[PDB]
Design a protein around this ligand. Structure first.
Ligand code: 118
Ligand code: 118
Lengths: 268, 268
């Protein structure tokens, strides 16, 4: 039968048959060489049935071409079986995050905090860990650590980009008497002097939020993320990090300082 | 900051930044007039965080653009929540159906039937209802059924292609008796007489397989489909159909005949 009628019996378009004949799939029965027409037989219906059945299961064209001729090979099906489960879990997570987005946006008219997942690699740092009574004494006592360590460690170069952060080792969020550690990243090791130490922090996967403005409201950021981990069925696994990007060392308007809070979490 | 350092602050490729500048999504702070170099600032990172945050919910570039610059436009988010809720369902069928596939393939290491879902539009048919004692007698009795109808009507033109079939109105099969109907599709209505009548048959969505060979193995097809609609969670809403494509009237070898088995189903 000619191609315009075969396309109505099969209920598909003609461009589909042209494309199939081009790629080497469902080659016609008899092509007339003078005019160039294509004539199909009832033998082609029983292969198109198989093509449409395999395509309705999500397979791509090259696997179907490799399948109809290498019929012993059946592991492509499992290769697809793992990707389907991955797709179900990702769509089931995007759905929950969209619902959380709408639930959060219900009462608040606009939103400040926008969470995002990311990867953080391994690093070498020099660090110092101690207890502080408050945050203001902390802000003033950091820079002595920076002048002093360069005094005792000659020629120590930082990394690119710069990574300078602090760890809140306490299990519960507090306002005074905080156990805190300060870390800055360098390229190579050195030797310890007094309380200043050198160590290696492993690689993590973390959820991040960026806060912009004055320090006093940073707890608000810590509110949102503390909601986030509970709302979308996640579990906080390790101590949070607070890494400093823009502060008093580059600018004078303290209402333009920007920092980023990262909670290492896992989908369990 | 130059493009190569900013690409390491954000952990993204350079071609992505070029593309985002071309689209109009993320425009650099300052561009050199003669070189053409691109320089970025911290607020570019605050915005890239928002871009990635929006991109993690599955939106495409145009909606992300429309979301960032324009008004809130909440109707786009819930409208997405349907495209996910639907998609999961779609996904949730296929992981089932492929799981059907394996439970049959690994039983025989050969596949005789492959099922596929399709849609059959509405038609105008002539039809005759009756009870049959034995299928062979029905085959023998069909040529007179053709003869009465062929003589007494002017301008009785069949369809292109030819759709002639038999309707099985029984719920649970038995070899003793069968309430069947013979149907052949025509273009227009007219007057009815005798045991034959004209009627319209509405469109349906059916699962079909194609059987080639004699009829004395046809039950082996049904036992397959009676499983396929039961395991993978679909529901049989109406009487099956048996459509005849190629037989003694076009061919000579009965082992090269070809028929099509159709089960009308819905998603339940
Ligand atoms: C060791 C200890 C502190 C700093 Sb810094 C800083 C500098 C550049 C970029 C990011 C951070 C600092 C502040 C004032 C004067 C000199 C250095 C610093 C201080 C307090 C809180 C966060 C960072 C550096 C090394
Ligand atoms: C009225 C009733 C049945 C048939 Sb046919 C047939 C005709 C066209 C296309 C396909 C089938 C038939 C049988 C023998 C010789 C010539 C025509 C027919 C026979 C058995 C089963 C189904 C249809 C024809 C007219």
């Amino acid at each position: 039968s000619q191609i315009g009628l075969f396309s109505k019996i099969c209920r598909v378009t003609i461009k589909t048959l042209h494309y199939y004949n081009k790629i080497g799939l469902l080659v016609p029965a008899y092509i007339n060489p003078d005019n160039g027409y294509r004539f199909y037989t009832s033998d082609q219906l029983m292969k198109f049935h198989q093509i449409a059945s395999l395509r309705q299961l999500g397979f791509t064209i090259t696997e179907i071409v490799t399948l109809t001729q290498d019929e012993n090979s059946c592991h492509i099906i499992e290769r697809r079986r793992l990707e389907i489960q991955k797709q179900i879990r990702d769509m089931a997570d995007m759905l929950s995050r969209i619902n959380h987005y709408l639930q959060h946006k219900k009462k608040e008219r606009i939103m400040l905090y926008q969470a995002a997942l990311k990867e953080i690699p391994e690093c070498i740092v020099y660090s110092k860990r101690f207890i502080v009574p408050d945050f203001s004494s902390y802000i003033k006592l950091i820079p002595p650590i920076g002048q002093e360590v360069m005094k005792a460690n000659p020629g120590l170069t930082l990394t690119t980009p710069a990574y300078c952060f602090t760890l809140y080792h306490d299990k519960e969020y507090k306002e005074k008497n905080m156990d805190v550690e300060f870390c800055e990243a360098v390229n190579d090791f050195g030797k310890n002097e007094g309380n200043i130490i050198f160590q290696v922090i492993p690689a993590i996967t973390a959820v991040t939020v960026i806060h912009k403005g004055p320090y006093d409201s940073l707890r608000n950021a810590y509110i949102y993320l503390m909601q986030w981990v509970e709302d979308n069925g996640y579990l906080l696994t390790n101590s949070p990090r607070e890494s400093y990007i823009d502060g008093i060392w580059n600018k004078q308007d303290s209402a333009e300082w920007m920092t980023e809070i990262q909670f290492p979490v896992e989908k369990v």
